[PDB]
Amino acid sequence: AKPVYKRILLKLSGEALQGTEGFGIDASILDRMAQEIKELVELGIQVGVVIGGGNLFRGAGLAKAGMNRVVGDHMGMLATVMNGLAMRDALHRAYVNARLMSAIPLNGVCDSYSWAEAISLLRNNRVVILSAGTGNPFFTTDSAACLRGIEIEANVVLKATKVDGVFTPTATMYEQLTYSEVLEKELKVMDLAAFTLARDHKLPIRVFNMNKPGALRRVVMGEKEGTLITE
Amino acid sequence: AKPVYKRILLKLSGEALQGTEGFGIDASILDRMAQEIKELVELGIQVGVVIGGGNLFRGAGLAKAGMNRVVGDHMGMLATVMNGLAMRDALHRAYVNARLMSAIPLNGVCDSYSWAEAISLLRNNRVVILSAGTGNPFFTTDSAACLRGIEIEANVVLKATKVDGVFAKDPTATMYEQLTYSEVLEKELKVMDLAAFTLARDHKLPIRVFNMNKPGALRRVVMGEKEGTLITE
Amino acid sequence: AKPVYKRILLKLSGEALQGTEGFGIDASILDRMAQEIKELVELGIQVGVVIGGGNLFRGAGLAKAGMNRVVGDHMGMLATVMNGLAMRDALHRAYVNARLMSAIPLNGVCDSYSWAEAISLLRNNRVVILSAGTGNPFFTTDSAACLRGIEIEANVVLKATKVDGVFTADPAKDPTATMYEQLTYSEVLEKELKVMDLAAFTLARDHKLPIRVFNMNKPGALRRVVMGEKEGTLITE
Amino acid sequence: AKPVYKRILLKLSGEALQGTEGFGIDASILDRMAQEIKELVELGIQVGVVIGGGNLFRGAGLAKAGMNRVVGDHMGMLATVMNGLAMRDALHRAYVNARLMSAIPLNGVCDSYSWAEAISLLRNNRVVILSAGTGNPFFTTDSAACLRGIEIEANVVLKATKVDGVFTADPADPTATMYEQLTYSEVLEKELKVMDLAAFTLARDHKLPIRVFNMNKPGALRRVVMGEKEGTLITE
Amino acid sequence: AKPVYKRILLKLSGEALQGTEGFGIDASILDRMAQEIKELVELGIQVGVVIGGGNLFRGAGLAKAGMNRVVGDHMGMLATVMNGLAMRDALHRAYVNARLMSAIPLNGVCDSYSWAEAISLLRNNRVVILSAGTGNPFFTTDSAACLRGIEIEANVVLKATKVDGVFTADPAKDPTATMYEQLTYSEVLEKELKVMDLAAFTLARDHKLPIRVFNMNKPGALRRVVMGEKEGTLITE
Amino acid sequence: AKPVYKRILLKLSGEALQGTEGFGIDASILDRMAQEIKELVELGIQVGVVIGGGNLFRGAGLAKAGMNRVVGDHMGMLATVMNGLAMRDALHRAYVNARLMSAIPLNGVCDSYSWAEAISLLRNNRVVILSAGTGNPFFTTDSAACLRGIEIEANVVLKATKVDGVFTKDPTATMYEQLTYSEVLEKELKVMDLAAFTLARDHKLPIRVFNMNKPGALRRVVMGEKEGTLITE
Numbered sequence A: 001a002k003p004v005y006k007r008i009l010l011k012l013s014g015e016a017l018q019g020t021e022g023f024g025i026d027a028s029i030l031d032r033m034a035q036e037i038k039e040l041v042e043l044g045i046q047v048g049v050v051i052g053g054g055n056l057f058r059g060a061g062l063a064k065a066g067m068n069r070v071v072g073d074h075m076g077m078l079a080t081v082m083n084g085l086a087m088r089d090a091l092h093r094a095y096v097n098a099r100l101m102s103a104i105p106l107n108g109v110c111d112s113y114s115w116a117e118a119i120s121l122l123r124n125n126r127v128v129i130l131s132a133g134t135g136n137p138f139f140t141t142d143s144a145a146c147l148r149g150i151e152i153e154a155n156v157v158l159k160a161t162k163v164d165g166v167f168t169p170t171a172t173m174y175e176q177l178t179y180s181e182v183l184e185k186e187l188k189v190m191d192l193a194a195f196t197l198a199r200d201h202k203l204p205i206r207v208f209n210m211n212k213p214g215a216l217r218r219v220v221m222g223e224k225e226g227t228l229i230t231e
Numbered sequence B: 001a002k003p004v005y006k007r008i009l010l011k012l013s014g015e016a017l018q019g020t021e022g023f024g025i026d027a028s029i030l031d032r033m034a035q036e037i038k039e040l041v042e043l044g045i046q047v048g049v050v051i052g053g054g055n056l057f058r059g060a061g062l063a064k065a066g067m068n069r070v071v072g073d074h075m076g077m078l079a080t081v082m083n084g085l086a087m088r089d090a091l092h093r094a095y096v097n098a099r100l101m102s103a104i105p106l107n108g109v110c111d112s113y114s115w116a117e118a119i120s121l122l123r124n125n126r127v128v129i130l131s132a133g134t135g136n137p138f139f140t141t142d143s144a145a146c147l148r149g150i151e152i153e154a155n156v157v158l159k160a161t162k163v164d165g166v167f168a169k170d171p172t173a174t175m176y177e178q179l180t181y182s183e184v185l186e187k188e189l190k191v192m193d194l195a196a197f198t199l200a201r202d203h204k205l206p207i208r209v210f211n212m213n214k215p216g217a218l219r220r221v222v223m224g225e226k227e228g229t230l231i232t233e
Numbered sequence C, E: 001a002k003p004v005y006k007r008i009l010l011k012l013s014g015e016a017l018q019g020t021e022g023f024g025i026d027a028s029i030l031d032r033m034a035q036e037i038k039e040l041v042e043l044g045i046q047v048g049v050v051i052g053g054g055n056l057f058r059g060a061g062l063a064k065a066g067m068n069r070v071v072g073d074h075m076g077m078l079a080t081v082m083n084g085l086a087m088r089d090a091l092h093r094a095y096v097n098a099r100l101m102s103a104i105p106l107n108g109v110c111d112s113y114s115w116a117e118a119i120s121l122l123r124n125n126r127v128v129i130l131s132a133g134t135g136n137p138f139f140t141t142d143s144a145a146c147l148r149g150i151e152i153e154a155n156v157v158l159k160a161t162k163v164d165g166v167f168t169a170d171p172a173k174d175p176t177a178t179m180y181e182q183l184t185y186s187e188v189l190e191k192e193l194k195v196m197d198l199a200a201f202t203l204a205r206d207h208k209l210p211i212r213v214f215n216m217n218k219p220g221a222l223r224r225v226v227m228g229e230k231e232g233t234l235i236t237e
Numbered sequence D: 001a002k003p004v005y006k007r008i009l010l011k012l013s014g015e016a017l018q019g020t021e022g023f024g025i026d027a028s029i030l031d032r033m034a035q036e037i038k039e040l041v042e043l044g045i046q047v048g049v050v051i052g053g054g055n056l057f058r059g060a061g062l063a064k065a066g067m068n069r070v071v072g073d074h075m076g077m078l079a080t081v082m083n084g085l086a087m088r089d090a091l092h093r094a095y096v097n098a099r100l101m102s103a104i105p106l107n108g109v110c111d112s113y114s115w116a117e118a119i120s121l122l123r124n125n126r127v128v129i130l131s132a133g134t135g136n137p138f139f140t141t142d143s144a145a146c147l148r149g150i151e152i153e154a155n156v157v158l159k160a161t162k163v164d165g166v167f168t169a170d171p172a173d174p175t176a177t178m179y180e181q182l183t184y185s186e187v188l189e190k191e192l193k194v195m196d197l198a199a200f201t202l203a204r205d206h207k208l209p210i211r212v213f214n215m216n217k218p219g220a221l222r223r224v225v226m227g228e229k230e231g232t233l234i235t236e
Numbered sequence F: 001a002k003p004v005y006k007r008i009l010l011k012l013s014g015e016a017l018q019g020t021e022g023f024g025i026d027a028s029i030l031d032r033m034a035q036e037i038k039e040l041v042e043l044g045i046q047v048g049v050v051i052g053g054g055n056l057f058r059g060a061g062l063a064k065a066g067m068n069r070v071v072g073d074h075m076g077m078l079a080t081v082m083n084g085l086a087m088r089d090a091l092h093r094a095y096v097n098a099r100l101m102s103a104i105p106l107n108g109v110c111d112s113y114s115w116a117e118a119i120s121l122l123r124n125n126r127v128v129i130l131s132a133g134t135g136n137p138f139f140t141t142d143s144a145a146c147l148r149g150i151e152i153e154a155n156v157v158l159k160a161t162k163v164d165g166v167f168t169k170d171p172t173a174t175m176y177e178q179l180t181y182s183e184v185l186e187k188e189l190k191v192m193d194l195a196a197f198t199l200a201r202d203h204k205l206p207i208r209v210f211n212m213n214k215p216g217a218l219r220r221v222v223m224g225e226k227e228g229t230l231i232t233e
């Protein structure tokens, strides 16, 4: 089997790592995800991963209590590094070479993000996990995925979601769209600022379903899974 | 009254900020804690706080799955910074001046720990929250509390726990009122991690174990009044 | 009068500091700008400034030659710090207290950005210059201005431009072009008006950060924008 | 032929990258410089480059207006990093492996200078570009080239200039002639303008050979390396 | 023979590098030590070294004069980096690949400690010297050796000392004195034996990190400790 | 009296802190030096100090053994920070406000050098100790003193030496009283490293060479009185 992508940026939601309790990190659901990535690696795909922090930091309640927006996003930012930290470990236990990089330098914990060092690592069959989003508050994990995606010169961003693509009860799942077509039809693919970044840099986005078994493997094979977004 | 301590290091367990769900940060339980600290500040006490990360990172399950011990502690270390981040915010919302410092520099998020800058801040009626423990793995939050306690030249470390001192599971027990470092090792009592305890002992840093859940217990511990156990020599 | 803003984020284009030669930094055009800011400070306004790097780095030619986009923006990012560096100096020579902060820490050159430290400095009658944009490539100086603006809790972002606000059409080329006085984020997207980069605009919209586009070349226009008087366009909702 | 140098430190003036407009970076003048370096690399030479910032920051006018000297030099320092940034990119587009290092750490932009990491990189056929001078103000780009040159244990510093070596008299004074070799003592004695005195002292005290040559003279660089007689050499 | 250890953490006292004058660094005593390590490297052992700073900073006199304890330990911390700096150099002169890492980042001098980068380097036949202890004051070099030892996943910590192991009672002031050969963490606390600082010891115990106390002065003792042969005391459980 | 200098950069040799044993740091010789500086502070002088590392690192022997020159200078660089560390402490024990800055950032130990932050500190009656020289190898402590001197806009660099100024080991020798940069190069006099000297010359930074051992000599150099040699133009 051959893949239509040599280098991808896989974007996970923090919740993707949640267990039944609807929070934290579930070891098995995580090792499962490590294996899915091990496949992509073995198919010769260079994999950058960007994780969110929703499973470790909600903070909707703290926002309600009046918590400063910036401080809130800094907490989420750290949350994403815990997830990345866990994922890098999960991969090493799956005998996959992996590095964790952080937008916010964390001395002794993981190396600081460098677009160049990331490319170098990906070219050496290292999975590169990219943490702490953009380094700034008020930017979604999507924004970070696209920014990183563009920097590391990925062929595509794979937004792993709970839904099986972009949908028009009835109607139908789109199969392909354009950046213009998505704005025009007012479809919810991702945060508008993140979307603009991908559009302006002609970075293809594939929305798919991480829960649909082997869906990831298929998205890479080029096969029709979820929606693709290009132009 | 008059506080018998001009500078204390209050050590909280991460769980201290947990809600009913037994995880995360509960806004009300947190703002409550900010208020308790606002009191100590208003009494003219200089307050350093050291928080753990247990409420945000358990990772006993990940350890079970074979997660590297170092990576595990690094996750907890970050966890403690989220708690500190939350607490600093909670205090500013209670109109208390507060700084967050981290053993691991976090550019743009909070300033890097400096024993000197910490003292300077405490002397300016800033509550100083100390995050990311010692900066190293394999050191308990207790160890960090003592280390920081000694560095900032605190008069005492207040270990806030769920129990009312050193002794509701056996009808045959009695709360100590004061002990010595030697007396605690000898009687094999569980005050805190042994490495942490040694650090306090060797630097003659008094430890007060008390009950954060017992209302006003904190206020009392400071007044000098008899609350929980004291440990000196 | 009385300024309707206690804290503003003034966003300058790098070119704003250009001389006649259309590049670099012109000492007099810079000292003038320092004076304009000295006024706002004296009126008791807390001033954050965000500068671009267009006057020091073009690099359209290098992009044409195939230069990597990231590297290009990093060069621009450094460019903005040179401008900030020059501006902080110009202000100290105008006896205005000023700090330079950078999104990319520059040991010994200026302090690293911290939203908190920025607020603290503004509250102490320091002009805070914010350099190196967002710290990332592919983000405009506008994006940086809004992001910083929201972080330091500014009341408004003042986009200083060469035009006197937002026009129904273009003024410099069309005699039917007239000037809006106020718009809404929705109204700007709907009427497809060019206020600023879309990503930057979304940031301001989602955080209800008012934007005032005005003309830095129109003498005293800055002073007026602050007085609340009608200068250029305002954008709120 | 065979290069008489295994490791050199090439020192460029920022202006070396200027276009016709007398400022900025000209893509073509830069890509040709990348190609000149690609040659040295494929001759098996280890190349460290030190660039100035004159093309991106003049600031004589701002000095005149009273700008603080330190701030001025910090601006130039950043300027050199922009040049280095451009040069590293130019080399990668010429399929030459290259790293940018900065005396002032720049998180995420390029790695921090380390004399040791520099040598390691040079030994792996990486061109190592060294930016932000010495990290300090009041030190010329020449000073940085010598300092770096000594640190990375280069065999020679190649000061690329607009003139074809050191002349008995001012070239652009029709009665001038070109030296072929001098000594540090001979240069101070004859009061010749090779480079800033502080920089020169550094090279002298560490017996670091300096070759002044003409970057505009085609293939002059290739020749300086071959050992052939181009511009002036300075040793002892 | 065959080394019973694939990765060790060798802990030296700063004094280990002292000359006759009882201070500083003696080139020959250092090059000697570099050679001992070159052996371990050639036997295929991955070697992490942790050095103290006692030879370069005493400061008992400054403590006496009232010097702040923290400041004192920071001076010692820097001291250890000077030793590590010297040792890395000594090894390169012995044609041994070696990296210096510091708990306190030292831009341009050596790279910052990273448990992961340390392991990577050891796996590439680099000797990894670990400096500045734990990065904190009030922690002994022993504590640093154990912490590092655990982090880099060493099989054993080799505490090189002036004595030939752990003794029941002093061997030169008692004829019935028999140097232990093996102990347990519990056995050492129980018998109240001085192996190392209590905090450091607890760290090794809780992580089941074997400790071998031996004599660096006894020629070839190091080589033997590694061979598995019975030199000095071992401490496990 | 009235000091003819509002801001000075005092350059000490590391050896200046040596005891009888000819190495290390002698507590009393150090506290003595702290007091001399306390005076200058009390006279309203802003004091920047630059210390060398000779007392803590010789390394002529290690150079002889083939040690890399860079590594050697890095060791000395660290040495200077130990001295500065000791001096900052000595000053706080003499109730003098003092900050330590390093050309090489040392997280948690002391703050990173910033020419601006240095000036700010000096203007707030802080003695500012400047460590790790220029941050680079192959630069003398003199070079660092001048560079720092120029950056912090000092009026003068006071090179404290063992000799009482610049002299014409001789029966026939007279102490100069004032020279010029040109006059010093011309007469081939040993004031300081040539690179360092050039820096001071090109920036018209006055240098006063004097004798730290001559009691009250420092106090006098500041009063404007004739002590050791002055070098200007």
Ligand SMILES: Nc1nc2c(ncn2[C@@H]2O[C@H](COP(=O)(O)OP(=O)(O)OP(=O)(O)O)[C@@H](O)[C@H]2O)c(=O)[nH]1
Pocket (backbone or CB within 6 Å): A085, A088, A089, A090, A092, A093, A096, A097, A098, A099, A126, B067, B068, B071, E115, E116, E117, E119, E120
């Ligand atoms: N169990 C575990 N080991 C780790 C982890 N991170 C680093 N290591 C160990 O440290 C070694 C070096 O890790 P890296 O920083 O990734 O360096 P590397 O040479 O690129 O090794 P790989 O990236 O794993 O291929 C790894 O091979 C592991 O032995 C982790 O997250 N979990």
Ligand SMILES: Nc1nc2c(ncn2[C@@H]2O[C@H](COP(=O)(O)OP(=O)(O)OP(=O)(O)O)[C@@H](O)[C@H]2O)c(=O)[nH]1
Pocket (backbone or CB within 6 Å): A067, A068, A071, B085, B088, B089, B090, B092, B093, B096, B097, B098, B099, B126, C115, C116, C117, C119, C120
């Ligand atoms: N809501 C909120 N605001 C913060 C927080 N941290 C900093 N700030 C804001 O940023 C300003 C600067 O904060 P600091 O860096 O702590 O400096 P400061 O002058 O000591 O401010 P205080 O600690 O309140 O005295 C504060 O006055 C607040 O307005 C936080 O955690 N939550």
Ligand SMILES: Nc1nc2c(ncn2[C@@H]2O[C@H](COP(=O)(O)OP(=O)(O)OP(=O)(O)O)[C@@H](O)[C@H]2O)c(=O)[nH]1
Pocket (backbone or CB within 6 Å): C085, C088, C089, C090, C092, C093, C096, C097, C098, C099, C126, D067, D068, D071, F115, F116, F117, F119, F120
């Ligand atoms: N000429 C000039 N001097 C500067 C500049 N930056 C700092 N300084 C010097 O540094 C002193 C204070 O440094 P700052 O970084 O501004 O810190 P500060 O404590 O806020 O001092 P001020 O902002 O000037 O009130 C000033 O008095 C200047 O002498 C600059 O950009 N240009």
Ligand SMILES: Nc1nc2c(ncn2[C@@H]2O[C@H](COP(=O)(O)OP(=O)(O)OP(=O)(O)O)[C@@H](O)[C@H]2O)c(=O)[nH]1
Pocket (backbone or CB within 6 Å): A115, A116, A117, A119, A120, C067, C068, C071, D085, D088, D089, D090, D092, D093, D096, D097, D098, D099, D100, D126
């Ligand atoms: N276009 C461009 N690409 C760069 C630049 N710097 C790094 N890269 C890319 O990032 C990858 C990693 O390069 P580096 O991290 O700088 O170092 P490296 O391991 O020596 O990689 P190479 O130099 O390409 O062999 C390179 O292969 C380039 O594709 C640059 O300045 N311009």
Ligand SMILES: Nc1nc2c(ncn2[C@@H]2O[C@H](COP(=O)(O)OP(=O)(O)OP(=O)(O)O)[C@@H](O)[C@H]2O)c(=O)[nH]1
Pocket (backbone or CB within 6 Å): D115, D116, D117, D119, D120, E085, E088, E089, E090, E092, E093, E096, E097, E098, E099, E126, F067, F068, F071
């Ligand atoms: N004399 C001396 N040279 C050094 C020292 N450290 C680094 N170097 C030089 O810098 C080169 C690179 O050393 P490293 O930074 O350790 O990189 P490396 O690839 O691990 O090189 P090795 O350690 O020799 O394997 C060495 O080959 C030496 O030439 C040192 O401490 N002393």
Ligand SMILES: Nc1nc2c(ncn2[C@@H]2O[C@H](COP(=O)(O)OP(=O)(O)OP(=O)(O)O)[C@@H](O)[C@H]2O)c(=O)[nH]1
Pocket (backbone or CB within 6 Å): B115, B116, B117, B119, B120, E067, E068, E071, F085, F088, F089, F090, F092, F093, F096, F097, F098, F099, F126
């Ligand atoms: N013993 C000792 N204490 C120090 C030293 N440095 C800082 N401290 C303590 O930490 C406090 C803060 O020091 P700084 O960082 O210099 O802050 P500061 O506001 O400038 O305070 P001072 O300089 O001491 O007036 C001091 O008041 C001392 O009590 C030192 O070198 N030795």
